[model samples]
Target: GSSGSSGPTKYKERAPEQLRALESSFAQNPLPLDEELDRLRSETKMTRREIDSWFSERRKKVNAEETKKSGPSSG
Candidate 1:
């Protein structure tokens, strides 16, 4: 950890709500897909699973928003 912890300072300070927002923004504006975990980590400062989970959570929110905006019949 940069500040002495299990993870980096940013990682530790990174709240789930912030991640949710980031994930949402990222979905609307996707970044280049990095096949290598090391490269992803180096570029995004997040673990591979974190990115994956973020994407998953992001997608879910996006879909939910779409569904809500579309109306009940759209589902």
Candidate 2:
């Protein structure tokens, strides 16, 4: 079964308002306990695995908040 062309498509770029729920959840706690997992699954309309993946990605960059602070343009 080696006869298929590679193609990219349909990345999940959630709507701005929709993302707000996830963002707020992250604010309260970037680390998702099982409780939060169910909360997000309902609020964000994503599976537990998807929610976990979101938080995982978010934690890295945010924990590296050094990026925002290290830059010199906070006027």
Candidate 3:
């Protein structure tokens, strides 16, 4: 035991409530505009980048799960 471990921060992960908020918003609209992004950012303390990353992953997953159709971006 070279060094002892106590705790630096109490938070291990984002709270389930905030996660649910994100999940709910994401389900409604994956491609969030700047307006909505700012609104969501205010609702949760998490960084905007973090929310963006979640959307990116979920967007792909949601699309892929939908029978893998042609991407609506460039088609």
- Among the numbered candidates, top lDDT falls to 2
- TM-score against native, each model: 0.39, 0.60, 0.53
Q: What is the model-wide C-alpha lDDT for candidate 2? A: 0.66
lDDT of 3: 0.63
Candidate numbers sorted by TM-score from highest down: 2, 3, 1
Q: Could you give candidate 2's per-residue lDDT for residues 17-67 as a string of tens digits?
A: 656888888888876677766776776787766667666666765666667
TM-score of 1: 0.39
Which lDDT tens digits does candidate 3 get at residues 1-75? 011223343324556777677777886788676667777776665666667766665576566664566545532
RMSD of each: 9.9, 7.9, 12.2
Output the lDDT of residue 13, model 2.
63
Error of 1 at 71 (Å): 10
The lDDT, on a scale of 0 to 1, for candidate 1 is 0.50
TM-score of 3: 0.53
lDDT of each: 0.50, 0.66, 0.63
lDDT of 1 by residue, 14-72 (tens): 56655654545574554325454344455457765566555554455556764535465
Q: For model 1, what is the alpha-carbon lDDT of residue 27?
A: 44
Off by over 4 Å in 2: 1-12, 68-75
Q: What is candidate 2's CA lDDT for residue 58?
A: 66
